[PDB]
Amino acid sequence: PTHLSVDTKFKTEGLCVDIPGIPKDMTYRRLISMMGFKMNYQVNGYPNMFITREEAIRHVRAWIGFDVEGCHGTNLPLQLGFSTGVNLVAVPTPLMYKGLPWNVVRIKIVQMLSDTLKNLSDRVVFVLWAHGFELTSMKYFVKIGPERTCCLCDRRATCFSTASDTYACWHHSIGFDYVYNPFMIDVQQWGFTGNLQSNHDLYCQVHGNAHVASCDAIMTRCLAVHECFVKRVDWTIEYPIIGDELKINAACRKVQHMVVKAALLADKFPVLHDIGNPKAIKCVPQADVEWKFYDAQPCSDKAYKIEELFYSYHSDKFTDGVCLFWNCNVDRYPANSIVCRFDTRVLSNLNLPGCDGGSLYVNKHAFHTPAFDKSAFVNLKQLPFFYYSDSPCESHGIDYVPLKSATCITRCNLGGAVCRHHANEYRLYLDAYNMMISAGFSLWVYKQFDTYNLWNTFT
Ligand SMILES: O=C1C=CC(OC(F)F)C=N1
Ligand SMILES: O=C1C=C[C@H](OC(F)F)C=N1
Ligand SMILES: [Zn+2]
Numbered sequence: 001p002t003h004l005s006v007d008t009k010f011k012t013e014g015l016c017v018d019i020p021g022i023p024k025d026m027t028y029r030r031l032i033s034m035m036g037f038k039m040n041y042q043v044n045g046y047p048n049m050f051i052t053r054e055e056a057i058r059h060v061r062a063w064i065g066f067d068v069e070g071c072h073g074t075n076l077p078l079q080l081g082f083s084t085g086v087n088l089v090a091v092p093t094p095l096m097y098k099g100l101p102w103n104v105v106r107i108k109i110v111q112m113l114s115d116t117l118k119n120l121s122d123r124v125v126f127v128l129w130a131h132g133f134e135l136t137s138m139k140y141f142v143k144i145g146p147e148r149t150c151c152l153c154d155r156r157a158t159c160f161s162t163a164s165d166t167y168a169c170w171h172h173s174i175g176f177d178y179v180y181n182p183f184m185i186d187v188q189q190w191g192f193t194g195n196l197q198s199n200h201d202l203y204c205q206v207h208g209n210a211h212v213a214s215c216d217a218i219m220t221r222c223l224a225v226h227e228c229f230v231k232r233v234d235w236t237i238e239y240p241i242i243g244d245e246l247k248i249n250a251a252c253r254k255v256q257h258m259v260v261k262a263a264l265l266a267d268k269f270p271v272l273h274d275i276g277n278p279k280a281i282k283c284v285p286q287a288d289v290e291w292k293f294y295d296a297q298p299c300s301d302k303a304y305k306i307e308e309l310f311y312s313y314h315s316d317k318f319t320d321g322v323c324l325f326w327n328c329n330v331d332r333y334p335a336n337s338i339v340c341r342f343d344t345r346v347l348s349n350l351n352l353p354g355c356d357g358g359s360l361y362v363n364k365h366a367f368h369t370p371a372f373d374k375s376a377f378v379n380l381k382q383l384p385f386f387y388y389s390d391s392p393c394e395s396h397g398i399d400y401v402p403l404k405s406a407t408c409i410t411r412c413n414l415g416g417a418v419c420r421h422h423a424n425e426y427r428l429y430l431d432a433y434n435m436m437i438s439a440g441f442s443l444w445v446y447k448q449f450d451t452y453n454l455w456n457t458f459t
């Protein structure tokens with residue numbers, strides 16, 4: 001029970017306005033045949049065009065919302081909408097394109113999917129709120145068959161070309177006209193009451209409904225993300241490495257140790273309240289400070305209310321010492337805080353569009369994160385970049401240009417000239433820092449934080 005059986009029943013009530021007279025009793029096997037895709041043999045790796053909710057969640061990077069509206073059924077133009085915001089009009093003879101035949105429309109579909117997905121996934125999962133025309137339009141741009149590899153590399157094939165009779169992955173599909181072996185899921189099969197807009201609007205105020213196909217496609221994918229990552233959370237599902245995941249996570253740990261260590265040295269807080277992940281470890285194990293942990297899982301719906309995390313009777317006195325919120329997203333941070341907050345607006349291959357302003361950050365695990373809100377940081381200031389080190393000035397062991405920087409807080413810089421070891425460490429730290437910031441992380445600190453207080457730790 002890993003794939004969706006083609007003999008599973010498909011509820012057809014959502015299809016009967018576009019397809020009147022559709023049988024109530026219907027399987028995926030009969031639906032696939034009705035879509036024009038009947039095959040005589042089982043294809044290994046491709047037993048069904050449709051997939052389970054569990055398989056869809058494992059392949060969230062491949063999700064592309066897709067809707068087809070009857071612009072005016074082989075006789076009328078169709079408006080094809082995608083969650084990328086694209087609307088294509090196909091004639092049978094927020095981007096909006098004018099009516100063109102299927103032979104040219106299909107080339108655009110392949111280019112758009114290939115550019116959106118080449119750095120995200122080995123496939124496409126069309127997320128539908130199926131009413132009929134989207135399923136019956138697939139035969140015009142989709143070909144199916146045995147699982148194949150790219151003609152130019154080892155990746156699985158996602159596109160086919162009728163011009164050359166060859167197959168390609170998303171990276172090598174330039175000029176290709178057919179989407180090959182796509183996957184799809186119909187959100188209507190999950191058991192909803194009422195239409196798409198009414199279910200979507202219960203959880204999201206960011207996506208509107210201009211009544212165009214891309215608006216519906218965006219809403220469909222958003223509702224699917226809400227169901228699978230907002231109200232339901234599975235942190236046991238692992239996702240493949242597609243970018244700088246390892247360097248980013250390594251940078252996060254280095255920056256956290258640096259910032260916390262410096263805050264403790266600079267302001268000598270007697271207690272640190274570490275609020276967040278129940279699996280957290282002391283990031284500065286050698287520090288004198290009374291380290292107290294408070295469990296809070298990463299909030300995937302709305303940011304935590306500080307009143308619920310702190311009040312309702314623990315050290316109790318969160319006002320004493322300093323509070324550390326490392327990716328623990330609250331509505332309004334207290335003035336005595338050290339904070340790392342993911343900015344959901346960031347554009348990257350790890351950060352997928354989410355629900356109600358939030359984003360789905362996928363790095364080893366999937367984390368739906370509530371919308372970035374600048375008002376959460378009103379009691380704090382942006383943490384400036386700095387590098388601090390009390391380690392001995394000793395090279396041990398890469399060419400060298402002398403470092404001159406006011407933010408290299410070391411004994412050698414206090415002494416007048418940055419040593420080679422501290423220059424190498426500073427440059428490595430700066431690279432890690434910039435990697436973390438560019439990934440979408442933002443750092444904030446209590447207003448009294450001043451790196452001038454670190455110089456006297458060298459006496
Ligand atoms: O008759 C068919 C055709 C396709 C299919 O699943 C997958 F290959 F698309 C299952 N049965
Ligand atoms: O503990 C974590 C790790 C990552 C995360 O995502 C972040 F971008 F919002 C949230 N909490
Ligand atoms: Zn390839």
Ligand SMILES: [Zn+2]
Nearest residue numbers: 204207222356
């Ligand atoms: Zn939405």
Ligand SMILES: [Zn+2]
Nearest residue numbers: 393412419422
């Ligand atoms: Zn040095």
